[PDB]
Amino acid sequence: ESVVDLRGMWIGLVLLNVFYLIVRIYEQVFGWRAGLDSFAPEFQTYWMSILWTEIPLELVSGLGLAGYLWKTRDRNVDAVTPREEMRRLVVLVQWLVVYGIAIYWGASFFTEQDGTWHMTVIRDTDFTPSHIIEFYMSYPIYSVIAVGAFFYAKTRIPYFAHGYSLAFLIVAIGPFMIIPNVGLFGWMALGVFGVVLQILMRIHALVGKEGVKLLTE
Amino acid sequence: ESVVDLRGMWIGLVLLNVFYLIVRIYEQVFGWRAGLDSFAPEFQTYWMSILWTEIPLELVSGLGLAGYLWKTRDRNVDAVTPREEMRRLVVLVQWLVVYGIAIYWGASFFTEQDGTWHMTVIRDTDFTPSHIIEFYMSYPIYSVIAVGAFFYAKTRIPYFAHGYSLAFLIVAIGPFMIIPNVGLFGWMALGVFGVVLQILMRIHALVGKEGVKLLTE
Amino acid sequence: ESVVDLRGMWIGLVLLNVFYLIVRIYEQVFGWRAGLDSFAPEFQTYWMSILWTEIPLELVSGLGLAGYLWKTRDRNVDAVTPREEMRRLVVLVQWLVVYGIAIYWGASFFTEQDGTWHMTVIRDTDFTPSHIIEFYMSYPIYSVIAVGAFFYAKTRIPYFAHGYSLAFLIVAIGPFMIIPFGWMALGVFGVVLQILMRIHALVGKEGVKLLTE
Amino acid sequence: HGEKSQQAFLRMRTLNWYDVQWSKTTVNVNEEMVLSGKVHVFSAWPQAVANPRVSFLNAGEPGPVLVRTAQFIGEQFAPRSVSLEIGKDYAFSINLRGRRAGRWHVHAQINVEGGGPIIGPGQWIEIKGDMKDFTDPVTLLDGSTVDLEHYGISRVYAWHLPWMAVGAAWIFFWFVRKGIITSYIRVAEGKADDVIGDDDRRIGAIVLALTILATIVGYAVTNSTFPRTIPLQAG
Amino acid sequence: AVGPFNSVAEAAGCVQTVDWMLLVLLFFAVLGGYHVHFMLTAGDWDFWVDWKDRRMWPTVVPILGVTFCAASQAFWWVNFRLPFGAVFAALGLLIGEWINRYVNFWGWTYFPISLVFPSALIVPAIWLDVILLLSGSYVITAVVGSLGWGLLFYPNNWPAIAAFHQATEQHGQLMTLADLIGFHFVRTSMPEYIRMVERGTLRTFGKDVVPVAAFFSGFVSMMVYFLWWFMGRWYSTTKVIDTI
Amino acid sequence: AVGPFNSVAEAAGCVQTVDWMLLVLLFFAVLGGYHVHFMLTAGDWDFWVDWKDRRMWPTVVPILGVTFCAASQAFWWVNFRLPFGAVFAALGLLIGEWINRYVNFWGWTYFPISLVFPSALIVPAIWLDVILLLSGSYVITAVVGSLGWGLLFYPNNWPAIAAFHQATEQHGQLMTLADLIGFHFVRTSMPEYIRMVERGTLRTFGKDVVPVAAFFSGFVSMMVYFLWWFMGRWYSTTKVIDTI
Ligand SMILES: [Cu+2]
Ligand SMILES: [Cu+2]
Ligand SMILES: [Cu+2]
Ligand SMILES: [Cu+2]
């Protein structure tokens, strides 16, 4: 039909950037005057709402995405034709671009932001405004998208199905080990190196000498 | 004749539990009033006797056991029949049960016991009552039994003979590296994991499909 | 012709031990009275001369040796005859003996020497007399010889040519990680073993078993 | 503002705070209120908290809603860390120039080396004006003035953003010149070598020569402007 | 019937008596190695009622405790699909400890069991084992397994512990009973100050001391778990080597 | 007509749009992982104008900085012979930081960008990248690469930094503007004394504080480089494993 859709990716990119934009805006407006005393009841309504909401909302969002993808798993995966595999890979490269950006937000943006809010309070708790967004929002979110990209490849692509790419395995799981080292040389998930190389190998296979050498030198 | 004897194992179990029972009793009676001043001469007769005895007694006991087992080594070991190999394994599982218990005493009982005696003196030397039993008795003892089990298997079983099981190698030698860290994460001898797995592999081989699948599912 | 020359090695040995002998003698005479105040101008003429001289001199001496050896590389190296390879090996054993001694001076003599000069000053800089000789002289020198021996083997011996012996690689490069339980270059173990493997090969059963038991 | 949550017995048995006063409980942007007070260093200093041998005086406030112009304690100008002797009392004061319009709750604060923050009393301090109007300024030794709120930010961007753009050039260059997939596949097959080989390396050697030259220049220039400069003053 | 066994009874009999011999020799075994390791590191907080605080003890013990549970699991579940690994090790320790506290700390030297009783592990041990049973994955156990193990620790100790955190007034000072037990029954070498228990800090906020400890103990036990799983594996090695 | 692509345009079209998607997802990605690591280690020296001294700052930052530039190079050069590894990471970081300093340090909390601006890395990154371009060797990069990387850091920062090392007299004491910017724009939690900037020693001789710092930064960067290059390799692993 067509190998390259993208429609879904843009749904993801837009649906996300928008959301954080809202959140960053909101925290501009209720960070300042509303999240400075944690013992105040204006904190229970504007910040402790978010924490108590998003956790069970993330948890379900997670298992849902997992469960669903395994359900709609392709039960005769080895049969996939070259054009459908190609299409399935370009979906996976999609999932990784939305993963990419979920990472940006939750690891750079809301992470170093907590750095500036440290210099703004002396601290009431470890449920500060930035902690809520950084630790209990942005991190779990990019952690869900991750599990997604992982389950999706596991249930659509022969290679990733029957196996467990270690690179990928790491990328999906590493996220549950950011809590230690520390409360905020090192063990990290650039495992995406392995995963794009594994994607790239399939793409090199899925063109005969025809595409390979000829079309591209 | 019969694969399973056990008579020997009980000789070991009984001969040991008894001995430590005596020793723990003895130390109840001479620990309290007799082993509190190391500069007193009542210490030379009740505690420094044991230390000076057991070491050359252990040393000979050790080499004896080793030398002897190597001598009575089966010089045509590859010939062993499936019934005799099975008997030989069940002896080896015996040795390990006497090892198991020689470990319990030396590593848990007399080891954590030193912890309570630490809170009972301020110290005259490093030849306290508990140190004599723990370091210079219970440890060497289980260390001999270990060397035994190892040599026994080496000279009775094709597999352990010609080779050096790494697991076993460790289980026999690790004992000589307990003295360091400390003189009084980590490196340990659960090397028995590999040894029983090596034993278990021979048992699974020594039954045809007949025993295997059939008799047991 | 002959497998065993040695002429070149003595040129090395003699040309080195002499030089250091000069240097040590020099530092006896100008270390004492001349290299105690680094702010004095007698320091600029007797010690800071050497520092500024040797480094570009070592840098060129280095690249020279390497460039040249690569150039004079044997372009048909797999062809080498068992007698020529044996000669080439015995040259390479030479290089290593000149290396061995450039190490001794650089890492034992002028190194532990700095430990006694430490107890003779309180310090003006890190360009003390000993530091000039130890870090900016003896060390670079043996480091050059090393790269030499490495390049020599690389361009004369089928084995070392096409490869990169791991031991040898280390031996030639580890020198550039001395500046920063330990990490060291006894990589010569592997290299002599690599040399010994070719010697064992370049004698038939004839030499091997027979001539020598 | 979190004093509430800190351990009760510790807030009581460390710093004992008295006669704390705020110049004015209202200021204009650029208008210069002052917070002062006295503190007695409890005599039976808890184990939990480092000895106050190293401490630092502070305006407990949600960011620079007020610039601090200066501060003093123990009769010294204290922009750096100071020693507090157990059992004695010290007097302090902080000169606070309004900056951001609102109603902030401003505290006297001192932190101990291996201790953490100890928060004094705090008073609401209504500021009014437009932040746009806030200035410093400050005088150099050379005699000139500079508005701190803005000084130097120009020059910074001036050097950072160009280089970031340079960095992004370098990447977009190689990217669209030899693809990811193309270059992957080339490499994956025999070669490689198609992907690089000079004069790709001529580009590199040139780009680098310009980079270093861009540095030696930028250095020498910024060395001519500001040919004075001293290291950060600490201790 | 079934060579090298004669009867079907001579097979099924020998099988069942080796099954015991293994389980026993394996039981201790790991008890010995678990205890020594654990006693050496986690002390100490385990010997004394007046070390069992809110910060240290519920941190170090989970973290130091999960080690052999993870390694025991690696062995029992990978080779026998048997879901009792953690429990096999947790209990092992407890028996080995309790025996000692009774026969020695008390039987030999006469410290009241109220002073010298161990930390309760068997509840977490179970959570840990059941997680590996349900998911068949160590990866999942590593995460939701150890995180449980972490959080359940204080809870499952509280029943034995609360009784001693009742307040007493001694010479015009407040003490908990535990403090006093320690103070009373005189240890030759144990000056309060050696303790390593919570002493307060300015960066405590609440009212939170135990929750943060356990969560911390949880998230760290994830790493220990992994490591000790693959070490449980490394130790399971059947490799034979050629020379020494 | 060129299966599994229909046209030659359906091929070359999908290629050029995957080439973007990777380049992008890969961009951050490493930016995410690099930033979290760097911020967590090299702080702190990078947040504050009043940490950027002559000793610590131009030591810790190159050393902690070279990490991802090494692994990124191990990734782009080995698999694609694309000589932008180091720059791909260095830039990643800078954006990530700058965005935050602007949008948050300033936008949200209002510290002047004169207080909160990052360290300059792109010049070193370039040196690194071109040294791997010219020699094709990571070993040569690891040596003459990282040594450049170390040396160039302060030089390439000076242009942004000089401005703030101008001297002011304040209440009879000397300060640099930088000290002042710090002192002025009040950080709730940043007592001078936490800093970790040069404070003098008796073993300083000169007049040498920066060159030593930079050469030191250089030589240490060599080891970090190696370690991180082979970690870049281990992270590029396509190994698939059988069970969890
Ligand atoms: Cu935080
Ligand atoms: Cu002892
Ligand atoms: Cu020196
Ligand atoms: Cu307040």
Whether F and B touch, i.e. at least 3 CB pairs below 8 A, reads as no
Q: Is E173 on the interface with D (CB under 8 A)?
A: no
Whole-number Cα distances in Å, F69 to B35, D133, F65, F138, F232: 65, 43, 7, 12, 9
- Closest-approach residue (CA) in chain C for F143: C176
Contacting residues of F for C177, CB less than 8 Å apart: 219, 222-223
Residues constituting chain B: 217
Q: How far apart are CA C50 and CA C32, in angstroms?
A: 16
Structure tokens at F238: 């396509």
Which uninterrupted H or E stretch holds C85? helix C82-103
Structure tokens at D179: 């693809």
Structure tokens at F162: 């000089």
| CA B118 / ligand 2 centre spacing (Å) | 6
Stretch 83-102 of chain D: residues touching chain A, C-beta under 8 Å: 102
How near does any CA of chain A get to the CA of E221, in Å?
Answer: 9
| CA C127 / ligand 3 centre spacing (Å) | 9
Structure tokens at D196: 């690089």
Nearest residue to D117 via CA among E210, A112, A118 = A118
If DSSP codes are grouped into helix, strand and coil, which group holds residue F216? Answer: helix
Nearest residue to D157 via CA among B167, F116, E6 = F116
Contacting residues of C for F205, CB less than 8 Å apart: 123-126
Nearest residue to C39 via CA among C128, C120, C104, C111 = C128
Structure tokens at A16: 């996300």
Structure tokens at B168: 């076993």
Return the bridge partners of D138, or none: D146
How near does any CA of chain E get to the CA of F243, in Å?
Answer: 8
Q: Is F84 on the interface with D (CB under 8 A)?
A: yes
CATH 2.60.120.570 assigned to domain D1-135+233-235? The reply is yes
Q: Is D118 on the interface with E (CB under 8 A)?
A: yes
Q: How far apart are CA D160 and CA D164, in angstroms?
A: 6
**B116 with E105: Cβ contact below 8 A:** yes
Contacting residues of F for A184, CB less than 8 Å apart: 40
How near does any CA of chain A get to the CA of D182, in Å?
Answer: 6
**The amino acid at B87:** R
| CA A130 / ligand 1 centre spacing (Å) | 7
Whole-number Cα distances in Å, F32 to A19, A177, F96: 19, 15, 8
Contacting residues of D for A125, CB less than 8 Å apart: 2, 5
Stretch 16-55 of chain A: residues touching chain F, C-beta under 8 Å: 24, 27-28, 31-32
Nearest-ligand number for the alpha carbon of B114: 2
Q: Are E32 and B107 in contact (CB under 8 A)?
A: yes
Which uninterrupted H or E stretch holds D21? strand D15-22
**E205 with D5: Cβ contact below 8 A:** yes
Chains sharing 3 or more CB pairs under 8 A with chain D = A, E, F
Cβ burial of A42 (10 Å; 0-12, 13-18, 19+) is middle
Which uninterrupted H or E stretch holds C200? helix C188-201
Which long-range contacts (C-beta less than 8 Å, at least 24 apart) are formed by B31-37?
A: B31/B117, B31/B129, B31/E108, B32/E108, B35/B128, B35/B129, B36/B121, B37/B124
**D10 with E202: Cβ contact below 8 A:** yes
Nearest residue to F87 via CA among F46, F57, F44, F131 = F131
Residues constituting chain D: 235
Domain boundaries, chain E: 1-244
Q: How far apart are CA D107 and CA D122, in angstroms?
A: 4
Nearest residue to D119 via CA among D174, D61, D169, D74 = D61
Structure tokens at C79: 């062809």
Stretch 129-168 of chain D: residues touching chain F, C-beta under 8 Å: 131, 136, 138-142, 146, 148-153, 155-157, 159-160, 163-164, 166-168
**D5 with A123: Cβ contact below 8 A:** yes
Domain D136-232 fold: Helix Hairpins (1.10.287)
DSSP F120: P
- Closest-approach residue (CA) in chain F for E135: F244
Which long-range contacts (C-beta less than 8 Å, at least 24 apart) are formed by F2-7?
A: F2/A210, F2/A211, F2/A215, F3/A82, F3/A83, F3/A208, F4/A3, F4/A81, F4/A82, F4/A83, F4/A84, F4/A85, F4/A86, F4/A206, F5/A3, F5/A83, F5/A86, F5/A211
- Closest-approach residue (CA) in chain A for D3: A124
Q: Are C131 and C114 in contact (CB under 8 A)?
A: yes
- Closest-approach residue (CA) in chain D for E197: D48
**The amino acid at B147:** V
How near does any CA of chain D get to the CA of A62, in Å?
Answer: 32
**C173 with F139: Cβ contact below 8 A:** yes
How near does any CA of chain F get to the CA of E136, in Å?
Answer: 8
- Closest-approach residue (CA) in chain F for D83: F193
Q: Are D99 and D66 in contact (CB under 8 A)?
A: yes
| CA D1 / ligand 1 centre spacing (Å) | 16
Numbered ranges of CATH 2.60.120.570 in chain D: 1-135+233-235
Q: Provide the CB-side half-sphere exposure for F97 (13 A, CA).
A: 30
Domain A1-217 fold: Glutathione S-transferase Yfyf (Class Pi); Chain A, domain 2 (1.20.1050)
Task: Kindly report the backbone phi and psi dihedral angles of residue B136, in degrees, each rounded to the nearest multiple of 5, phi listed first.
Answer: -95, 10
Would you tell me how many other CB atoms lie within 10 Å of the CB of residue F242?
Answer: 7
**The amino acid at F58:** P
If DSSP codes are grouped into helix, strand and coil, which group holds residue F106? Answer: helix
Q: Please provide the DSSP assignment of B132-145 as one string.
A: HHIIIIIHHHHHHH
Domain boundaries, chain C: 1-213
- Closest-approach residue (CA) in chain A for F30: A190
Q: Are D76 and D124 in contact (CB under 8 A)?
A: no
Helix runs in chain A, H state only: 7-31, 42-46, 48-71, 82-103, 110-118, 129-133, 139-156, 166-173, 192-205
| CA B120 / ligand 2 centre spacing (Å) | 11
Nearest-ligand number for the alpha carbon of D62: 4
Q: How far apart are CA C164 and CA F138, in angstroms?
A: 14
Q: How far apart are CA A206 and CA E179, in angstroms?
A: 72
Contacting residues of E for B185, CB less than 8 Å apart: 227
Q: How far apart are CA E29 and CA E27, in angstroms?
A: 5
Nearest residue to F7 via CA among A94, A213, A2, A214 = A2
Nearest-ligand number for the alpha carbon of A125: 1
Which long-range contacts (C-beta less than 8 Å, at least 24 apart) are formed by C107-114?
A: C107/C138, C107/C139, C107/C142, C109/C20, C109/C24, C109/C138, C110/C134, C110/C137, C110/C138, C111/C138
HEC string of E95-139? HHHHHHHHHHHHCCCCCCCCCCCCCCCHHHHHHHHHHHHHCCCHH
Q: Are A135 and A182 in contact (CB under 8 A)?
A: no
Numbered ranges of CATH 1.10.287.710 in chain D: 136-232
Q: What angle do CA C30, C34, C40 make, to 5 degrees?
A: 155
Task: Kindly report the backbone phi and psi dihedral angles of residue B129, in degrees, each rounded to the nearest multiple of 5, phi listed first.
Answer: -45, -60
| CA B126 / ligand 2 centre spacing (Å) | 7
Q: How far apart are CA E232 and CA D125, in angstroms?
A: 62
Structure tokens at D4: 């509430």
Resolution of this PDB entry, in A?
A: 3.2
CATH 1.20.1050.50 assigned to domain C1-213? The reply is yes
Task: For strands E167-170 and D145-146, give the pairing.
Answer: unpaired
**The amino acid at A113:** Q
- Distance between alpha carbon F37 and the CA centroid of its chain, in Å? 11
Nearest residue to F83 via CA among F144, F126, F32 = F126
Task: Kindly report the backbone phi and psi dihedral angles of residue C203, in degrees, each rounded to the nearest multiple of 5, phi listed first.
Answer: -120, 130
**F35 with A111: Cβ contact below 8 A:** yes
Structure tokens at D217: 């220049």
Q: How far apart are CA F84 and CA D196, in angstroms?
A: 12
Q: How far apart are CA D14 and CA D127, in angstroms?
A: 32
Q: How far apart are CA F88 and CA F30, in angstroms?
A: 9
Pick the CATH number of E1-244 from 1.20.1450.10, 3.60.21.10, 3.20.20.70, 3.40.50.720: 1.20.1450.10
The residue behind tokens 């899925």 is A206
Would you tell me how many other CB atoms lie within 10 Å of the CB of residue C192?
Answer: 13
Q: Are F50 and F195 in contact (CB under 8 A)?
A: yes
How near does any CA of chain F get to the CA of C125, in Å?
Answer: 6
Q: Nearest CB to A179: which of E205, E212, E219?
A: E219
Q: Are D90 and D41 in contact (CB under 8 A)?
A: yes
Stretch 205-244 of chain F: residues touching chain E, C-beta under 8 Å: 244
